[PDB]
Symmetry: C2
Subunit: 435 residues, 2 copies
């Protein structure tokens, strides 16, 4: 019973806003219409009461048919899933039908938003169905068994990064996917005198010694208003990188944080494809980003990936064209400085904190190449000179600022203020996707 | 290590034409030819501080790029570097990001081959990463480091950052030269440089590698990429009637010719590459499904990119099915679903989702629960005969339109040549 297409669409749509494309084609899916918090959205849920939900010819039809609506009406499209993959009896006709939907999504990839919202079953093509989409909000009772196990969002929030969002309950998946279509579509404009009310000294949320770890998620809370955002995609994945979407003086912004709590904020292969996909997202949807840099470097020692698996994040920033402001609070080193929306990748503006050092090796201590033939093997007795124990008399801002690659130094009380100011001064832009 | 000769040791004997005076930053950028093709190049000076990447150098590679893109010419990099001048600081470090910045404005437009010969750390280990084909010389250890660690044999396995491993530096120059003869000398299909070529091939688990070889020219080499990394999948360029051709085939040997988190990726970029260079393709199916990695996690989100690549694919892409092909993967391996050109087949090749034995499993549910045990395991081998026909029989998926027409084992090359030919070049 509760797996009813209309009962469900009725749960996502604000009640009396619903329409209906295809017949009550009791085939597997229902493709209704209507708005989300006001803004119109083509959708499609699947009937999990009618033959497993396994996607068939007839059922796929309205699905694809619904694409070319939302695609023609440049309105967003959403899919509350619940399918045991393809209908084994239909032969290939279904396989074909299962496969036209894929390409139905792929054509929308960045033209309209494509939230998927999986409530339960999700296998085979329906396991790849929402892969192609843009944001996967998994329902706490949704599983994934496509063997050609165990099931759950708890396994994808971590490990696989497959599921973008775990929901408090299936009903929240309706409530969650409903804001992502608002943020993707009611980003609105900026507001100069609205962050002014919330100019917290953000440097307060920073450790004492630039050596003592912390968690950047709390810092984030400050830059974003109080309502009520994050809405950060798989926190449990790429733990040294906390990406996430959200509003700022009304206007919606992508946020990519380098969380030093885990791995010391250090980037890596698995840490890139989080960002690397998250940037081109807010890029291909005209959403400003913010970069909160505090990363030492990048790495057991899997070279099995890295170089390629880290090139793409540069490619994410270097090809991106949305308004994007960077800021460094402490760290920013080497080929990782470069990789964090720096000027060499065409940043909008780049900001920094009082002790926001910027070097290719660090500073305490990063001299063991310059001072190579000295600070060496006389005793190891008293390593307080040392090398170990330049730094303060360089690195910070001006050491990179007169060079221009950093644009300013700022009072963190009005950290929020600055970005918003810097972000409001670029033009709206949006790109494509592929080659 | 000396840049000049080393650049004269790549170009056509001629031909090298310095796009500046020879300084000491650690870069030498010069124009020239390869089989008569306007080619721009650049090489890091292995001598000067280990080929390090600094400001006035990167600048030159930049101006190489601006000139490659200006003139619509491919762009090669020769790399005996190893990072970015540790004592030029942010300038150098920013000098590199500029080079990416160029290189990033290079994907999908002009060709870009990296032919590493010396060390490579940081930006030097990252330049290659933004260049389409990565050709790694023996001694050329991309000996990259964090904050062996990987030679050419090593960076062809589990990583596979390189594409064509060499066996000597100069030959690697014969690699990278011929390698532009494919992108910028694609050629045009010849209708009769196809005929005297198609064997009755079908007459042969197994190994797929030697099938691809018979599809392409008998003469022209099979420049396979990636091989040892992601092996259950096969990719690599060649020719057909003179027209350059891309090829990707399942690999009955490892992993049961199936898809896996690595597999789909290797094919994935490979396609996006070709549709970004007008080159047409050939896809010889034999995937019997997917596989995790036990990451059942990656393979889903990571499998998607096969769907995309073909979805977003506007170059010709004719498919050949060899025997079995199944589910998402079957759809994945260049199906009509993803706007395919045409699909041909061979007299003994089935298109289904799982197939007999499987195509009766769990469906009949009341089977291994309500049947005589001393026959269940044997009557499990029974439901396959009616199946094979009523399930998976290809004279099904003929009418259904997904496999255009069945082609004879003799008349194979002509076909994979014909359909690619009569097709449009764009859209």
């Amino acid at each position: 019973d509760p797996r009813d297409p209309l009962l469900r669409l009725s749960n996502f749509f604000d009640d009396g806003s619903v329409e209906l494309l295809h017949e009550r084609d009791r085939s597997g899916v229902l493709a209704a219409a209507g708005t989300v918090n006001g803004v119109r959205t083509i959708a499609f849920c699947t009937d999990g009461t009618v033959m497993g939900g396994a996607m068939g010819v007839e059922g796929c039809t309205h699905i694809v048919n619904a694409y070319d609506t939302a695609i023609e009406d440049q309105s967003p499209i959403v899919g509350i899933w619940h399918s045991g993959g393809a209908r084994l009896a239909e032969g290939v006709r279904a396989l074909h039908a299962v496969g036209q939907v894929f390409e139905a999504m792929i054509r929308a990839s960045g033209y309209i938003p494509q939230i998927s919202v999986v409530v339960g079953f999700a296998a085979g093509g329906a396991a790849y169905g929402p892969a192609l989409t843009d944001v996967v909000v998994m329902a706490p009772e949704s599983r994934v068994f496509v063997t050609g196990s165990l099931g759950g969002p708890e396994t994808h929030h971590k490990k696989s990064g497959v599921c973008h969002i775990v929901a408090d309950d299936e009903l929240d998946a309706y409530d969650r996917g409903r804001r992502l279509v608002g943020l993707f579509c009611q980003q609105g404009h900026f507001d100069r005198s609205k962050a002014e009310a919330g100019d917290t000294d953000i440097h307060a949320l920073l450790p004492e010694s630039s050596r003592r770890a912390y968690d950047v998620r709390p810092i984030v809370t400050a830059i974003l208003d109080a309502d009520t955002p994050f809405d950060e995609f798989q926190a449990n994945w790429a733990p040294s990188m906390v990406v996430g979407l959200g509003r700022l003086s009304g206007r919606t912004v992508g946020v990519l944080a380098n969380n030093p709590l885990r791995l010391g904020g250090c980037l890596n292969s698995e840490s890139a494809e989080k960002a690397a996909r998250f940037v081109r997202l807010c890029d291909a949807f005209g959403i400003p980003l913010v970069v909160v840099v505090d990363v030492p470097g990048y790495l057991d020692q899997e070279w099995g990936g890295v170089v390629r698996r880290g090139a793409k994040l540069l490619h994410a920033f270097g090809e991106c064209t949305v308004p994007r402001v960077t800021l460094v609070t402490r760290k920013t080193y080497g080929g990782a400085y470069i990789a964090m929306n720096s000027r060499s990748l065409n940043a909008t503006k780049v900001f920094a904190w009082p002790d926001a050092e910027v070097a290719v090796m660090g500073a305490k201590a990063a001299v063991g190449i310059l001072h190579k033939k000295k600070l060496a093997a006389a005793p190891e007795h008293e390593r307080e000179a040392l090398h170990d124990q330049h730094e303060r008399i360089a690195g910070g801002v001006d050491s990179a600022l007169d060079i221009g690659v950093v644009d300013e130094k700022i009072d963190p009380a009005h950290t929020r203020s600055k970005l918003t100011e810097a972000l409001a001064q670029a033009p709206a832009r949006r790109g494509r996707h592929k080659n």
